[PDB]
Design a protein around this ligand. Sequence first.
Ligand code: HEM
Ligand code: HEM
Ligand code: HEM
Ligand code: HEM
Ligand SMILES: O=Nc1ccccc1
Ligand SMILES: O=Nc1ccccc1
Ligand SMILES: O=Nc1ccccc1
Ligand SMILES: O=Nc1ccccc1
Ligand SMILES: O=Nc1ccccc1
Lengths: 143, 143, 141, 141
Amino acid sequence: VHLTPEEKSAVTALWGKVNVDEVGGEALGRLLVVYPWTQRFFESFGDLSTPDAVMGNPKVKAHGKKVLGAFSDGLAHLDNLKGTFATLSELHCDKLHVDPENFRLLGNVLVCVLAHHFGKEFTPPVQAAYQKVVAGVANALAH
Amino acid sequence: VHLTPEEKSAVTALWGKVNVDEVGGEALGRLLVVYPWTQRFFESFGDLSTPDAVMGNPKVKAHGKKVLGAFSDGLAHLDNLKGTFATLSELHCDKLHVDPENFRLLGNVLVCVLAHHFGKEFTPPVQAAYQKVVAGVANALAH
Amino acid sequence: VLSPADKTNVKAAWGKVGAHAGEYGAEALERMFLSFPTTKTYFPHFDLSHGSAQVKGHGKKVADALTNAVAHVDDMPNALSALSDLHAHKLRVDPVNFKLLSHCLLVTLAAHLPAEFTPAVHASLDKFLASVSTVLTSKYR
Amino acid sequence: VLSPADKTNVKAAWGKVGAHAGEYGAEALERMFLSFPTTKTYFPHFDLSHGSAQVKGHGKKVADALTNAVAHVDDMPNALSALSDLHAHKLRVDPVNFKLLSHCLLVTLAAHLPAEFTPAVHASLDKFLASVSTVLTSKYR
Ligand code: HEM
Ligand code: HEM
Ligand code: HEM
Ligand code: HEM
Ligand SMILES: O=Nc1ccccc1
Ligand SMILES: O=Nc1ccccc1
Ligand SMILES: O=Nc1ccccc1
Ligand SMILES: O=Nc1ccccc1
Ligand SMILES: O=Nc1ccccc1
């Protein structure tokens, strides 16, 4: 994707303040709570039986860190997302070969979590810039 | 996209038998009938009142030819669909900027029309090869 | 809601399908497995080869479920109740996969019913299959 | 179908929204127009600039329609009957656009209701908005 300078600024400034230890777990966990079929993709992750359990599961939280890492990698190489993510998808064998819609669902849950954590600061223009990035990272990660 | 040789063969051999003057209008027309919101994309095309009216509209039939032409161009350059379609999207201003899902819907209607016209010949492996092409052309045309 | 004309169109197409219902279900499944290979992950224990008796038998079960929905088309939440719980609650089928199977069912009918698959009947069958899909995805927890 | 706990969760979140309902609708619309610019094509006659009184008035209409659906949550097809005909039959809104507005409504609630937007309530609100969207897309001809 190509971001305008204001869009790049809108993303970068708020991204610097994200709690990188928690926000990924919260988004990945809400994905499993809100869209329960996604738990099938993570049946190797243990107990996903209730909202509280999902949200406290340690491998949720761990791979949540990795989801943010993929966002940061994407933001750093917006003009070559496929080259950025090629090793990431391939190291996974078939695990990332699910419908592209679930990557768009994950990106939108992440947007919801950023709105939850930043409140008024997650303005409509800031959201719009993030939507460009989460769309690009979604397309590349499902390829 | 990369097609295997038998996939390319499956697409190419049946594509050579397609009636290029009608199959495009049938697909584009069934799109408007089965998914009526798509008529809004074609307000400049005249009467889209009934199924019989949609199927008979000459501009439907004319742009149907153009849809097949886009498919053939895609099959000719499967490894660089964006470079194939860049001038095609740009010559339309913002006419092609609808949700990518509608390009997937058109591609799947085209598949239904090919099954309708070819019957048993449109085998499951033949369909699967066409699904690869219509998915790649949908992604490129929506970019 | 399905219109009176939709209900007539769907029942007419099923009528012409006749006793091939089971075989056409198997064909739709094969079309889905080859075209959309992620769907195979729900059947890792099936043999998915062409001619597989497991695919044939499962295709008859799927056709019979659709025929039950046709036969109770105004009471589909009740009639499909057990299958919604199975697919949504137990199997956790991705709802995108119902659009994929619906598409393959349409392709199968088109490839066998050239006279019946008019634009109007195509639209009615799409609406019917989407209604079934809506019921089958209604009970996620 | 929405569960009793969904219905409670939705009504609780609307309770906390309180009299800001109109302003949050306007904000959701603005979020939709900026994030998903193709949706602006349905509003070519509106001024979509920030602070636009037309977006403010329309956001109040949308919020009032959601509140009516909340207030008649077990009778949503009848309550939303006129709006389903307007969106699907008259304005021909692409059904994808209802997912985009629902997402922006969720983002708006999350940005204003940090305590209320728990994962459970988020799941309930998503189900409710998808139910409204299903109603508003039910009458395509
Ligand atoms: C959905 C988006 C996903 C992203 C962005 C992602 C990201 C990553 C990354 C960045 C790594 C290795 C490097 C590192 O840890 O920093 C990794 C490894 C791994 N991933 Fe994922 N992953 C995703 C989904 C999944 C799924 C669905 C599964 C399994 C069902 C999975 C299982 C694994 C395993 C087993 C490893 C390596 C071994 C280990 O660390 O335990 N990941 N992933
Ligand atoms: C949906 C896929 C579409 C494809 C693949 C397509 C294809 C094409 C192509 C290849 C051309 C170049 C002229 C030619 O080679 O004959 C063209 C021109 C044109 N297209 Fe499209 N088109 C599509 C949709 C639309 C839509 C939605 C509109 C909206 C009105 C539109 C309006 C036009 C117009 C006005 C021209 C100039 C020539 C003319 O028709 O007067 N097209 N199109
Ligand atoms: C038109 C939509 C569908 C209908 C009418 C339908 C019908 C059925 C029926 C009747 C059964 C029970 C078979 C038995 O008890 O022997 C079943 C089971 C099953 N369905 Fe579906 N189904 C549909 C869609 C799907 C889709 C889209 C998927 C996944 C891609 C799926 C995956 C499964 C699986 C994995 C089972 C269990 C198979 C086994 O282990 O025997 N279904 N379905
Ligand atoms: C939660 C979903 C929605 C609700 C509850 C809703 C509600 C409403 C209401 C109450 C009106 C009537 C306004 C009036 O009479 O003054 C309306 C009209 C309208 N809606 Fe929606 N709507 C929804 C989704 C959408 C979406 C997704 C779009 C398109 C992106 C859309 C496009 C329109 C348009 C263009 C009008 C006419 C606006 C005008 O010219 O005044 N609606 N809607
Ligand atoms: O940017 N973070 C994302 C990771 C996976 C899918 C979508 C978005
Ligand atoms: O492919 N694995 C995914 C897991 C969660 C969201 C999107 C994709
Ligand atoms: O192959 N022809 C297509 C044209 C537009 C969208 C999808 C397919
Ligand atoms: O607006 N452009 C279109 C995209 C897909 C199908 C038909 C039209
Ligand atoms: O909502 N905050 C505002 C921002 C700019 C102008 C007016 C209000």
